[PDB]
């Protein structure tokens, strides 16, 4: 598990600065293999972002990808991201190929996003999706044992995947982001109450838990205090912006 963690999804990652974090999660499109190797040389462990449950892109972006057959026309679909059928062969094949490409680039692991997006499907279809998700993650782990798998949540499949995840992230614990509104928004107690049962099960298993909380740059003093608060509560935190385009904070100064 990480001593500290940073996420950076924007262009031009400041590599010297990110290299001082223990785990760093990156959008690989913005790095070359020499950059990934540099982070490892400095002693950091670099992860590549990989969205498992959704195709990141508008429609027509997905048209040019050759993956359209696998898109699920869910009711509450977000613009610029498409929920994918985790049982569709072209989608699973795409993800495994991407995993191999990212291994070849030198990434020590993958940060697996949208593990709960199948919950947007019609209720009677969710179990089929959950089982396809679990079987996919088991196949990914078997095919790429050299990639540490850093789950974003995934509570509905973690219990059936012992030894698979190296850590589990939760956005968010105290300070969150309302993407629908484009507003920073504290995490309601309701959300922490629902998380407690899942996080306690992970804590009991010794699973490292990362907190991804959100505060804007002008509240950097508050972000440091929150980082400290999250560490006192057992999390390895990163407190940053929702674009992950900012050198946020994981620990004290």
Cα–Cα separations (whole angstroms), residue 109 to 16, 80, 91, 151, 190: 20, 25, 20, 10, 32
Asked whether the beta carbons of 45 and 109 are under 8 A apart, the reply is: yes
Asked whether the beta carbons of 95 and 136 are under 8 A apart, the reply is: yes
Q: 22 — phi, psi (to 5°)?
A: -70, -55
- 177 vs 223: CA distance, rounded Å: 14
Resolution limit, Å: 1.9
| Residue of 85, 32, 96, 29 lying closest to 62 (CA atoms) | 85
- What's the number of domains the chain is made of? 1
Task: Cite the beta strand spans of 94-229 per DSSP E.
Answer: 109-113, 148-152, 165-170, 175-178, 183-186, 209-214
User: Domain range holding 13?
Assistant: 1-253
- 184 vs 181: CA distance, rounded Å: 9
- 168 vs 1: CA distance, rounded Å: 10
Breaks (C-N over 2.5 A) in the chain follow: none
- 68 vs 248: CA distance, rounded Å: 36
């Amino acid at each position: 598990g990480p001593s500290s963690v940073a996420f950076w999804y924007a262009e031009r990652p400041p590599l010297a600065e990110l290299s001082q974090f223990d785990w760093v999660v990156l959008e690989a499109a913005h790095l070359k293999p020499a950059d990934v190797g540099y982070l490892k040389e400095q002693g950091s462990t670099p992860f590549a972002y990989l969205s498992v449950g959704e195709f990141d892109g508008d429609a027509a972006a997905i048209a040019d990808s050759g993956l359209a057959r696998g898109k699920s026309a869910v009711r509450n679909q977000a613009w610029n991201s498409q929920v994918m059928d985790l049982a569709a062969p072209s989608w699973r094949a795409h993800l495994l190929k991407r995993a191999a490409e990212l291994r070849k680039q030198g990434y020590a692991g993958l940060f697996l996003d949208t593990l709960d997006s199948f919950q947007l499907q019609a209720e009677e279809r969710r179990e089929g999706q959950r089982r396809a998700l679990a079987s996919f993650l088991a196949q990914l782990h078997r095919q790429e044992p050299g990639l540490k798998l850093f789950f974003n949540r995934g509570f509905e499949v973690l219990p059936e995947l012992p030894g698979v995840a190296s850590a589990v992230a939760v956005a968010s614990i105290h300070a969150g982001w309302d993407a629908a509104a484009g507003q920073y928004r504290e995490v309601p107690q309701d959300d922490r109450d629902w998380l407690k049962g899942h996080l306690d099960a992970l804590r009991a298993q010794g699973m490292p838990i990362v907190a991804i909380d959100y505060l804007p740059p002008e509240r950097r003093d508050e972000a440091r205090a929150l980082a400290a608060r999250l560490r006192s509560e057992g999390y390895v935190p990163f407190v940053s912006t929702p674009a992950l385009d900012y050198l946020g904070v994981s620990d004290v100064e």
